Amino acid sequence: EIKELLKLGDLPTSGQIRLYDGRTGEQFERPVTVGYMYMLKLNHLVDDKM
Amino acid sequence: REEAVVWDILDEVIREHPVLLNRAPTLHRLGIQAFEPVLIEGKAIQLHPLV
Amino acid sequence: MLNTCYRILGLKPTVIFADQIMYTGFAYAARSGASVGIDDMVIPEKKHEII
Amino acid sequence: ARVTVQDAVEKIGNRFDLVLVAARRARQMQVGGKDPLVPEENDKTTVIALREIEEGLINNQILDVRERQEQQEQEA
Amino acid sequence: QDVVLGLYYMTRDCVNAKGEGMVLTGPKEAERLYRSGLASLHARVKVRIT
Amino acid sequence: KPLVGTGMERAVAVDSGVTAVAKRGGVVQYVDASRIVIKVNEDEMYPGEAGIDIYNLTKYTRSNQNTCINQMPCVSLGEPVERGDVLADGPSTDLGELALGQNMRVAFMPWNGYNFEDSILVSERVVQEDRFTTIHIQELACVSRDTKLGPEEITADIPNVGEAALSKLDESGIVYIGAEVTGGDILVGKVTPKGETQLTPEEKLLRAIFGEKASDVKDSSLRVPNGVSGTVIDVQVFTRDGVEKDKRA
Amino acid sequence: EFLKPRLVDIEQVSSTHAKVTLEPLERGFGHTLGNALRRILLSSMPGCAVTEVEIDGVLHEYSTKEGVQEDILEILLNLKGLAVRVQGKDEVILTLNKSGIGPVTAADITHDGDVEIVKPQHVICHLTDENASISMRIKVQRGRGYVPASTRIHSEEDERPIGRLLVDACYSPVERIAYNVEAARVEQRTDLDKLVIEMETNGTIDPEEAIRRAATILAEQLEAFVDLRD
Amino acid sequence: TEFLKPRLVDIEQVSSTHAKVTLEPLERGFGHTLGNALRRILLSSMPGCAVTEVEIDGVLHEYSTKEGVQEDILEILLNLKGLAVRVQGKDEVILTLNKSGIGPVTAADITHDGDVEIVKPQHVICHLTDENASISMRIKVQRGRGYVPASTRIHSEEDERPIGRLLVDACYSPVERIAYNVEAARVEQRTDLDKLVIEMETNGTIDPEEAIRRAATILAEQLEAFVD
Ligand SMILES: Nc1nc2c(ncn2[C@@H]2O[C@H](COP(=O)(O)OP(=O)(O)O)[C@@H](OP(=O)(O)OP(=O)(O)O)[C@H]2O)c(=O)[nH]1
Incomplete structure (x- = not known):
């Protein structure tokens, strides 16, 4: 189902795309996994721990 | 107030002074090591990866 | 590699060589661009057979 | 020599009385009764005393002889 | 861990790539070749070393 | 989401x-x-x-x-x-x-x-x-108790503090709502009665020389914690029955 | 033996989106210039952004106006995005005054000569009461890069007015930049390439001026760099 | 508006061919933009002169052995690839080597011509043994930009050439090695600034500093179109 829906978006069905190194501009070998993940900021804040 | 002069004196004191880093479970004698400090921005301690 | 470097040359070179190894390794690891996709882990063709 | 004191221990093999000798010298340097025998690189007296030890100019015996030298000179 | 991965990637050999059977006068030329994109980072080669 | x-x-x-x-x-x-x-x-x-x-x-x-x-x-x-x-x-x-x-x-x-x-x-x-x-x-929270030397007061008069720090306080000695503060800043001014300093001689000499009239009140005012900077969003005042509320209360 | 790049057709697909092409690029400099330009464009493009706001009945970012629905903090966040083009002067004080029921968009700001509001449709607030009226003064400065509220305190210069509401300054109009080097086969030549720089901005800097300014900055740094006084 | 221009640019050239250059302070991010631009342009596109083709009077394929030369044809090829030639006026010239007797055929043994200067007269080429010691060859030197491997000439050799025509990789670019390290540098209060360490080894012909200078010059010269 993920493969189908990714095709509906017109994106690579394997979910990896080639990325260019922002410093030099050369491409990375072997395209890498990109995509959106839901992340959380925990209550452990450096401001308090220092 | 903490103007540039204080930062210069702090830099000069820190130069050759070593500080000790320890982690609460000091298993063996390498749980305490001394390092030469490098002043950096932020509130997080940066330690060399290899160690 | 590190061990022999220590045994033949001595400390100072082993330290410098270790640092160099870290830096180069990180650089070229970044240039490699290795990642982990869902299709990279291939179910053996004969699983259901043995089952 | 603010990386590895390995060569100073190769000069003095105890690796413990080494640090004591270096402490006597570096306190004789801090309280400015004497001056560093090595061209300073804006270093503190710790690595100065270590560098002085590694070149063989100072040890326990040289420290004692020069100390009794200054003592007997100042007696006059 | 990350280091070993990088070095591992660097040293591994491949059946076929760019510049199979090229003769280089030294490692510095090898590196010059790689950084220009005229050869793959791993490819079997004859090199002069001291 | x-x-x-x-x-x-x-x-x-x-x-x-x-x-x-x-x-x-x-x-x-x-x-x-x-x-x-x-x-x-x-x-x-x-x-x-x-x-x-x-x-x-x-x-x-x-x-x-x-x-x-x-x-x-x-x-x-x-x-x-x-x-x-x-x-x-x-x-x-x-x-x-x-x-x-x-x-x-x-x-x-x-x-x-x-x-x-x-x-x-x-x-x-x-x-x-x-x-x-x-x-x-x-x-x-700043709480003003009464010691046996005398009840403390919330007034803005704080001995030997620069008036730069007082500037943000009203006559009552309470921060204005909405003032931007930083670590070290004084929020509520408070002083406590204390005398008989018993200074060592040289201080007496210095008091004579410069005309240093010793103020009998120690400082206690609630300054902001180290390294904290924000806006004062709200203030509350709790006075016990009997005591004379101040202008801000 | 070299050639040089001349600015050729500069198409604009949308008001924000622009494609700028450079036709006579010798082999190998496609990527070099693509990357250098990308870097400078993203980092150094001088732009305008809202620096501070004064609304009358509001002491601090957390309070609330009668008859509006967005919080003061959200109104500030909306003002952060306001794209404004000032021509001559560096610091403008725009005044927005509107009453009654309706969505107050950025167009309602009193239009001054030197100031151009690129997107009048940008929403600011929604009124909900016939007599509810908001007045405010937005002070907009010129600047490059990103300066937060907390840093600007260094230049306080007697910030005494509690009415002043600081906003983080995103001093940068360029949103996105990509380049494509494609062989530009001219009927009499072997190996020449064209750079196609596709750039998306908030509609303040025109593409030509951006590219020119980037090339200028790079040229100055290379001037300093080439000479070596040992 | 107004940028920060770097000062205190010191250059400590250990081993005239090896030059380290330190440059600070640079606005955020320009460490890598300039390091990369410089490296790329310097390395891939640099006008130079180098040995391209070789003709040995004795052997038809590069894997055969000549009588009395210890080094294989591969070894002499590699020794000639490293040879640093700087020609003044003429673009492509055909140099002849004829040497006899025991010992090392060195760059000195090449015919001493006017316009072509051999910067390293003592570069070893071949070892010749006793009683036969006959070496005769024609080495062609051409001027060109960058690095071009043998494989593309042999690919694109529609001009079919006689036997013996042994192509060697043409190393035109005089910079042999170049790298840039970026490091943290603070201008007394701003920490978001960086240092550029440019390590360069060139092959004698051009001094490293001059390599840097002309590389940056040509890059700026390309950029000229827009800088007002
Ligand atoms: N661990 C490590 N050390 C490095 C590395 N690279 C260089 N070093 C050494 O660290 C020391 C730092 O020297 P510098 O900091 O550059 O000299 P400086 O104090 O006068 O400025 C040098 O040796 P030194 O202190 O002068 O040795 P010594 O003569 O004092 O015994 C240098 O050789 C590295 O990558 N890793």
Whole structure:
């Protein structure tokens, strides 16, 4: 189902795309996994721990 | 107030002074090591990866 | 590699060589661009057979 | 020599009385009764005393002889 | 861990790539070749070393 | 909102008491950033005095962990709403749905050993957009007791402090609402009676020389903790019965 | 033996989106210039952004106006995005005064000569009361890069007015930049390439001026760099 | 508006061919933009002169052995690839080597011509044994930009050439090695500034500093179109 829906978006069905190194501009070998993940900021804040 | 002069004196004191880093479970004698400090921005301690 | 470097040359070179190894390794690891996709882990063709 | 004191221990093999000798010298340097025998690189007296030890100019015996030298000179 | 991965990637050999059977006068030329994109980072080669 | 959820997040959000939910569905008559007033439908309208329903929302109060708990109105003027619709989203809630955090574009790859271990590399772009900035509402308390040397007072007169620090205090000695402070700044001025310093001689000599009239009151004023900087959002004053309230109270 | 790049057709697909092409690029400099330009464009493009706001009845970012629905903090967040083009002067004080029911968008700001509001449709607030009226003064400065509220305190210069509401300054109009080097086969030549720089901005800097300014900055740094006084 | 221009640019040239150059302070991010631009342009596109083709009077394929030369044809090829030639006026010239007797055929043994200068007269080429010691060859030197491997000439050799025509990789670019390290540098209060360490090894012909200078010159010269 993920493969189908990714095709509906017109994106690579394997979910990896080639990325260019922002410093030099050369491409990375072997395209890498990109995509959106839901992340959380925990209550452990450096401001308090220092 | 903490103007540039204080930062210069702090830099000069820190130069050759070593500080000790320890982690609460000091298993063996390498749980305490001394390092030469490098002043950096932020509130997080940066330690060399290899160690 | 590190061990022999220590045994033949001595400390100072082993330290410098270790640092160099870290830096180069990180650089070229970044240039490699290795990642982990869902299709990279291939179910053996004969699983259901043995089952 | 603010990386590895390995060569100073190769000069003095105890690796413990080494640090004591270096402490006597570096306190004789801090309280400015004497001056560093090595061209300073804006270093503190710790690595100065270590560098002085590694070149063989100072040890326990040289420290004692020069100390009794200054003592007997100042007696006059 | 990350280091070993990088070095591992660097040293591994491949059946076929760019510049199979090229003769280089030294490692510095090898590196010059790689950084220009005229050869793959791993490819079997004859090199002069001291 | 989570891009990839499980479907339970609406149940979690509604069932928690942080959302404000409609009891008799109808049409939203007036919307403000403090109250949502809804006109109920004649169908569900109770025969005797149905009238309209008014929902007072809660704005930035301090949570148990010191985080902000404020509700924002979701619906607009003239929207028809049904019984059990989500009027205002509570903290970390969107359109009724649980939004615990935020969804970011991640790429799995080693980037020059700055993510060496489980550490994470992040782009200036996230901080620029202010999407991971939290509001923390901290409480501070200054309490004036009465020692046997004499009751302490809250006046603004604080011996040997620069008037730069006093500038932000009113004549009563309380910070103005909305003043921006930093670590070290004095919030409430307080002095305590204390005498018989018993100074050593040389201090007496110096007092003679410069004309240093010794002030019998020690300093106690509640200064802001080290390294904390924010806006004074609110002030409260509790005076016991009997004592003469001050202008600010 | 070299050639040089001349600015050829510069198409604009949308008001924000522009494609700028450079036709006579010798082999190998496609990527070099693509990357250098991308870097400078993203980092150094001078732009305008809202620096501070004064609304009358509001002491601090957390309070609330009668008859509006967005919080003061959200109104500030909305003002952060306001794209404004000032021509001559560096610091403008725009005044927005509107009353009655309706969505107050950025167009309602009193239009001054030197100031151009690129997107009048940008929403600011929604009124909900016939007599509810908001007045405010938005002070907009010129600047490059990103300066937060907290840093600007260094230059306080007697910030005494509690009415002043600081906003983080995103001093940068360029949103996105990509380049494509494609062989530009001219009927009499072997190996020449064209750079196609596709750039998306908030509609303040025109593409030509951006590219020119980037090339200028790079040229100055290379001037300093080439000479070596040992 | 107004940028920050770097000062205190010191250059400590250990081993005249090896030059390290330190440059600070640079605005955020320009460490890598300039390091990369410089490296790329210097390395891939640099006008130079180098040995391209070789003709041995004795052998038809590069894997055969000549009588009395210890080094294989591969070894002499590699020794000639490293040979640093700087020609003044003429673009492509055909140099002849004829040497006899025991010992090392060195760059000195090449015919001493006017316009072509051999910067390293003592570079070893071949070892010649006793009693036979006959070496005769024609080495062609051409001027060109960058690095071009043998494989593309042999690919694109529609001009079919006689036996013996042994192509060697043409190393035109005089910079042999170049790298740039970026490091943290603070201008007394701003920490978001960086240092550029440019390590360069060239092959004698051009001094490293001059390599840097003309590389940056040509890059700026390309950029000229827009800088007002
Ligand atoms: N661990 C490590 N050390 C490095 C590395 N690279 C260089 N070093 C050494 O660290 C020391 C730092 O020297 P510098 O900091 O550059 O000299 P400086 O104090 O006068 O400024 C040098 O040796 P030194 O202190 O002068 O040795 P010594 O003569 O004092 O015994 C240098 O050789 C490295 O990659 N890793």
